[PDB]
């Protein structure tokens, strides 16, 4: 420790820890996930009398192609690649969020979670991870669960902890399969490693207060994913069980 | 609920759907991935009477070394590096797939799936991730399954769901061992009908089922082999 710098280094480590201070640091530095209220604002500021239609179009890009704007434009129809390149220019759509408030097509989808899941269901044959992939895994996997925005519809209130956890594990059956399609590397990962890679936005979505819990519940009931008393459907229990397995 | 933006979000979800509008969007945005026609089209006119041997060679390189054309030539025989480099120049072979028109050895291999898989079986001892690997995990893992091409041959019709599922499971057992060896390489595109888009093109199901029965992976009554039933077990047992 004789050098004056190694002396300072050694000293740095000889202090007591301000636990509280380091924990505030940990909280700031910690994934919080997207802000939907400001993604909506931006879409509505930007699109005006054309924002609902532009958004629907971006959400369907989200559902079917993910965030891969450029790669996808190179393989799609000319009229599609045109709209898409335009809407990117128009809203400043990015493939990966550099900042909070960056607008990725997935985040738009998430911010409007009830629509996106209904459209996912309505367009299930166009999903890269849809009915054909989910049938390999279980029977009757609910199509509404077939997008990146489902986690924001799972309740935490008005529903038992156990329900929330079954809904999460059932959703995770899809997340697992989806993750392996988006990140081929996860095809050689353990379940837990794959689970960690989507754990953070999953919890953020479930725990967020932006989209109100009572409507998540009413919606899940309406779709049949929650029974008349707020308990997951049998298909959902079957899917959670298949996730827990093997 | 509590925020005008929240209220907007739930109100957006209460909109009745316009199926026609949303399907238009879907069809026009559908990503094609691989178009085998474009690749065979290019290889053929360009090669001429010289194309079939050039394709075979490109695919043998694809089964042994994937895309690493340059890295690969650096250490292969002079004859190997010469012929191989000649073919890159001739056909425009790239290592990464940038555009829909990009020609990689793997894409060539996947445009002719039946051949590849069959070459693969016959050159199994030269496969990077082969029997030595998979005879540890099961016995008699089908050698045809041991490559990138196979996923293109999974039948989605004319067979039972139990059969499609068994083939997907049996094959995932190889994909998974193979992806691990790549996840670790010091520094790619998998393909099958179930993950592919409405836009994509595969050998028709009946040709898939026919080839499968021919190589013995499916039996003559449509049902997967023991070696497949089994090795799908190994997968299902984690
Ligand atoms: Na690990
Ligand atoms: Na119930
Ligand atoms: Na609509
Ligand atoms: Na079409
Ligand atoms: Na290995
Ligand atoms: Na049979």
Curated annotation (Swiss-Prot), chain A:
Transmembrane segments: none annotated. The keyword RNA-binding applies. Keywords: Capsid protein, Host cytoplasm, Host Golgi apparatus, Host nucleus, Ribonucleoprotein, RNA-binding, Viral nucleoprotein, Virion. The record marks 65, 68, 71, 96, 107, 185 as: RNA-binding. RNA binds at residues 31, 68, 107, 187, 197. Coiled coil: none annotated. GO terms for molecular function: RNA binding. It is found in: Virion; Host cytoplasm; Host nucleus; Host endoplasmic reticulum-Golgi intermediate compartment. Pfam families: Tenui_N (PF05733). One of its GO terms (cellular component) is host cell Golgi apparatus. InterPro entries: Capsid_Phlebovir/Tenuivir, Nucleocapsid_Phlebovirus. The keyword Plastid does not apply. The N-terminus is involved in homooligomerization. Encapsidates the genomic RNA, protecting it from nucleases. Displays high affinity for single-stranded nucleic acid. The encapsidated genomic RNA is termed the nucleocapsid (NC) or ribonucleoprotein. The ribonucleoprotein has a non-helical structure. Serves as template for viral transcription and replication. After replication, the nucleocapsid is recruited to the host Golgi apparatus by glycoprotein Gn for packaging into virus particles. Belongs to the phlebovirus nucleocapsid protein family. Homodimer. Homohexamer; ring-shaped, necessary to form the nucleocapsid. Homopentamers; opened pentamers in solution. Binds to viral genomic RNA. Interacts with glycoprotein Gn; this interaction allows packaging of nucleocapsids into virions. Binds suramin, which inhibits the replication of SFTSV in vitro. This is Nucleoprotein. It comes from Dabie bandavirus.
Swiss-Prot record, chain B:
The keyword Isomerase does not apply. The keyword Plastid does not apply. Pfam families: Tenui_N. RNA binds at residues 31, 68, 107, 187, 189. InterPro entries: Capsid_Phlebovir/Tenuivir (IPR009522), Nucleocapsid_Phlebovirus (IPR015971). Signal peptide: none annotated. Encapsidates the genomic RNA, protecting it from nucleases. Displays high affinity for single-stranded nucleic acid. The encapsidated genomic RNA is termed the nucleocapsid (NC) or ribonucleoprotein. The ribonucleoprotein has a non-helical structure. Serves as template for viral transcription and replication. After replication, the nucleocapsid is recruited to the host Golgi apparatus by glycoprotein Gn for packaging into virus particles. Binds suramin, which inhibits the replication of SFTSV in vitro. This is Nucleoprotein. It comes from Dabie bandavirus. The gene is NP.
């Amino acid at each position: 420790a004789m050098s004056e710098w190694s002396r300072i280094a050694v000293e740095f480590g000889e202090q007591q820890l301000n636990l509280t201070e380091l924990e505030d640091f940990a909280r700031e530095l910690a994934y919080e996930g997207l802000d939907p209220a400001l993604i909506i604002k931006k879409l509505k500021e930007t699109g005006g009398d054309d924002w609902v239609k532009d958004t629907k179009f971006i959400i369907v890009f989200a559902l079917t192609d993910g965030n891969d704007i450029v790669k996808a434009s190179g393989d799609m129809s000319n009229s599609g690649s045109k709209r898409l390149m335009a809407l990117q220019e128009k809203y400043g759509l990015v493939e990966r969020a550099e900042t909070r408030l960056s607008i990725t097509p997935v985040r738009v989808a998430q911010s409007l979670p009830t629509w996106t899941c209904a459209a996912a269901a309505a367009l299930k044959e166009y999903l890269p991870v849809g009915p054909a992939v989910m049938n390999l895994k279980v029977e009757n996997y609910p199509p509404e669960m077939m997008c990146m925005a489902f986690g924001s519809l799972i309740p935490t209130a008005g529903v038992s902890e156990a329900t929330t956890k079954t809904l999460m594990e059932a959703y995770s059956l899809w997340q697992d399969a989806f993750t392996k399609t988006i990140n081929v590397k996860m095809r050689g990962a353990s379940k837990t490693e794959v689970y960690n890679s989507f754990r953070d936005p999953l919890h953020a979505a479930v725990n967020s207060v932006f989209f109100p819990n009572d409507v998540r519940v009413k919606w899940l009931k309406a779709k049949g994913i929650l029974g008349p008393d707020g308990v997951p459907s049998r298909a959902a229990e079957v899917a959670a069980a298949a996730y827990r397995n093997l």
